[PDB]
Design a protein around this nucleic acid. Structure first.
Ligand SMILES: [Zn+2]
Ligand SMILES: [Zn+2]
Lengths: 497, 497
DNA sequence: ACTACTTCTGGAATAGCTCAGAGGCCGAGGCG
DNA sequence: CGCCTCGGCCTCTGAGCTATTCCAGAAGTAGT
């Protein structure tokens, strides 16, 4: 610093008048000078205008005098006055247009308070009161903002969540009982706007445009992300869900989920490694080498695992067993998805009978450009614009049908699931694993990684969590408690007992 | 003469805003056109904007319209209106900054009056006052509220419903006859707003948004609340409907409904337990164990019990008797629904009993993916994009058609209904049950859950309300009177009488 | 089916709101 | 004792937002 700043810190500028030549009169001013000069003017100004409020602050080894005047005055006069009392030093006084926000920012770092004609801050020209009967307009900006912070992407959810804020905050059972975080954290703030929102004739539009803005930023921020980064982010959100689940407060017996792991690890040879290999194939996403084929009988695990994996990295599954004149709206669900999963692809005529016939395989054989991922495609939605992008990678699960040579080639890897009675029986005595839908859950798989993969594998950015989580499982499940689960599962009894 | 004024006369430009293209809104405008047009506009402008004052003047072979509007408009809006009114050879619209100076100069030698609103000119005592009130318009919120309290999600229905309140509620037949709940309970309250409503041009819009509100809440709940909660929440709703139903205001004979309980309790063995069972199934939503199958002839009871249970947990009835591809929108109805009911499904092989062959059964077989609930499916809606979720659980009612031992394995419970004579004649002896739709009402099914099942077996949330409702029941209906009803109903005689 | 008529959505166009900058007007006092 | 300037008032305006209306075309529908 040149020891005397040439203007207010760029942290309060948006609250000050941007005028350069105006004879407008204000009632809220802010001077920025030296510690000694401020200290002095604090008393000179106080009486000079019979202020209704005033307060000195600290700013970058200097002072800032924020005061509210009863009557209106133009910065001109306020300035010409403070001048006469200095004759030297630096003095930059301006008009304040954001009273509260200004004072507010000044009471918090990097600004500190020193003096003030009122200990409890203030609420006059500024606010809590004086709201009176001015024209009430809804703030679309504030709705979108909300959507942004809650990373909202569903108009229905938004509309309903915001309508909740319409009600009084102080005595809101929902905020007291603190049921949903994405509510008790934004209500008080969005309360005023919401109440006005409850009267808007454009509710839907306000929400649609909001959610559209979030989807916008999201698609942009993705471009600046690797892909291993996207997976790390996903692992994070999944980990965030987990903290709440197995938390001191929440329905989620960590023991019941570790049971699923013990079950999912017997679904295939070296399960923990497969997932890792899988994840890498999805992260690297290599042209003509980004799809796996899960092939097997009904109730062989190919569906459960595919689902799990699908939730792990995040994404959606689609059903291409339909007329090509309806195959496009379905293919479109893949948009902006990390990975895709073609669930239960059917074939026509094949391998004897008892096998449902369908177009699923035919269709896939006419979507090589979608599987190869060499050239982008035009995924579409209703009433929207044909969004173009590289089709996401994924898995394809199918029964024992005949796969055309052309299609096969697009499957860098094929896994054959063979029914295991010792697994089927184990489940028949573990209702909770199907009840709480744990074997088809990605959280179940993520735990598995945390329990088998070395800390060094996961991204450095979150290795911290992985370690703390790993240690969490160690104390909870000794090399005995868990071994008991694997044993029972291998013997087909009951994961727990 | 050839000029045909490109702008207002120079000596007036001094009181005119020369930025016709702006967002500014004012209440004093001037139009420069020909004699005939001004004369025509004088009348059309007076009506369109219910001007506070208007006058026509002479300006070099042409006319000039000066007028004050009770409310602000932008010059462009005024100009745009005049345009679509008639044809012009030349037209100039400008805002007037200096009101009084504009008029006075228009009466000066250079110009002259031809006609005007108030005989006397724009006297300054009232040439720039305060605008007022602004005609009251329909309250969208208020309509929404109604749709909310009645959980209405049908725009067409809501529209018709709300239009009934337009009429006076004084000598209103429906209001006095206490014929409809969701009418005499709201009419008096919405009368005033419905009156305007009935004259609004956006009726369909208003309702469209009130519905989105109802849809929005369901989307929120399903996304946050747990299956238990949803049910309970549905019970509190049913209870709030029963109170008013059997209340002083209402007109429901609690002694007639309690009869239905006795009848229904004769449809199936341990019926009070079957309902508890059903509820558990629906609430636990366990993969492969979420669907029940009702099979029987007409008035076999299935149609009744199904409908009742459906209302108990609140769900939607579907119809899969369409082409295995034409039912993509009929299945989307399940979106955000607790439970669904595939009513009267048709099959094959019923020719033997004059049972029309359909696609229903064959369709359910190709939707085992939906009935199971192990994976999520993408549900469609007209003009809207796919919704990914696990298809809700429910019931499948069908007549005496054939069911492959492979399809039967898609259901955990199969309640076969058989014709009951001693139960039929009792319905003839008690013709009132059908008339008041008590036989297949979710209310009765709730009462039956109160006249049997334990108290602490309910949710600790609605315990108290169930306790005090279990009072009035026995405290009124003798512990034997019910027994006498559940007797003659097994004989063939009327319930009560 | 392929083609002719209807309902629905999103984006464009149109309209009204309030804020704060750039300046014009004017009584009252400073000063040689 | 009159030019000049201070300091509060007020309005015309560019701007950014919010509110309503319109509209071309896609999504869904009935029928040859
Ligand atoms: Zn709250
Ligand atoms: Zn009525």
């Amino acid at each position: 610093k040149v020891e005397d700043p040439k203007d207010f810190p760029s942290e309060l500028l948006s609250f000050l008048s941007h005028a350069v030549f105006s004879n407008r009169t204000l009632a809220c001013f802010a001077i920025y000078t030296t510690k000694e000069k401020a200290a002095l003017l604090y008393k000179k100004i106080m009486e000079k205008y019979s202020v209704t409020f005033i307060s000195r602050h600290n700013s970058y080894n200097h002072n800032i005098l924020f005061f509210l005047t009863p009557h209106r005055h133009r910065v001109s006069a306020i300035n010409n006055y403070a001048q006469k009392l200095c004759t030297f030093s630096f003095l930059i006084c301006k008009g304040v247009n954001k009273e509260y926000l200004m004072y507010s920012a000044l009471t918090r770092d990097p600004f500190s308070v020193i003096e003030e004609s009122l200990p409890g801050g203030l609420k006059e020209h500024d606010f809590n009161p004086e709201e009176a009967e001015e024209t009430k307009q809804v703030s679309w900006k504030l709705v979108t903002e909300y959507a942004m912070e809650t990373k909202c992407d569903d108009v229905l959810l938004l509309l309903g969540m915001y309508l909740e804020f319409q009600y009084s905050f102080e005595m809101c059972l929902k905020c007291i009982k603190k049921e949903q975080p994405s509510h008790y954290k934004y209500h008080e703030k969005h309360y005023a706007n919401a109440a006005i929102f409850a009267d808007s004739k454009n509710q839907k539009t306000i929400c649609q445009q909001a959610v559209d803005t979030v989807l916008a930023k999201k698609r942009v921020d993705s471009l600046q992300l690797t892909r291993e980064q996207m997976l790390t982010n996903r692992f994070n959100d999944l980990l965030d869900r987990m903290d709440i689940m197995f938390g001191s407060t929440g329905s989620a017996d960590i023991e019941e989920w570790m049971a699923g792991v013990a079950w999912l690890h017997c679904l295939l040879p070296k399960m923990d490694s497969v997932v890792y290999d899988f994840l890498k194939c999805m992260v690297y996403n290599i042209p003509k080498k980004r799809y796996w084929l899960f092939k097997g009988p009904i109730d062989s695990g190919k569906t459960t695992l595919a689902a799990a994996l699908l939730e792990l990295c995040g994404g959606k599954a689609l059903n291409v067993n339909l007329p090509l004149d309806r195959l496009n709206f379905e293919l479109g669900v893949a948009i902006d998805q990390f990975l895709v999963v073609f669930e239960d692809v059917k074939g026509t005529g094949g391998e004897s009978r008892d096998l449902p016939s369908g177009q699923g395989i035919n269709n896939l054989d006419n979507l090589r450009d979608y599987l190869d991922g060499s050239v982008k495609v035009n995924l579409e939605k209703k009433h929207l614009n044909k969004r173009t992008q590289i089709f996401p990678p994924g898995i394809v699960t199918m029964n024992e049908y005949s796969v055309p040579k052309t299609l096969q080639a697009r499957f860098v890897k094929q896994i054959d699931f063979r029914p295991k009675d010792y697994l089927k029986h184990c489940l028949e005595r573990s209702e909770f694993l199907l009840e709480k839908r744990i074997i088809q859950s990605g959280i179940a798989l993520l735990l598995m990684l945390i329990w088998y993969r070395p800390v060094a594998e996961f991204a450095q950015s979150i290795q911290s969590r992985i370690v703390e989580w790993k240690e969490r499982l160690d104390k909870e499940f000794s090399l005995s408690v868990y071994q008991k689960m694997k044993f029972n599962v291998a013997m087909g009894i009951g994961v727990l007992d």
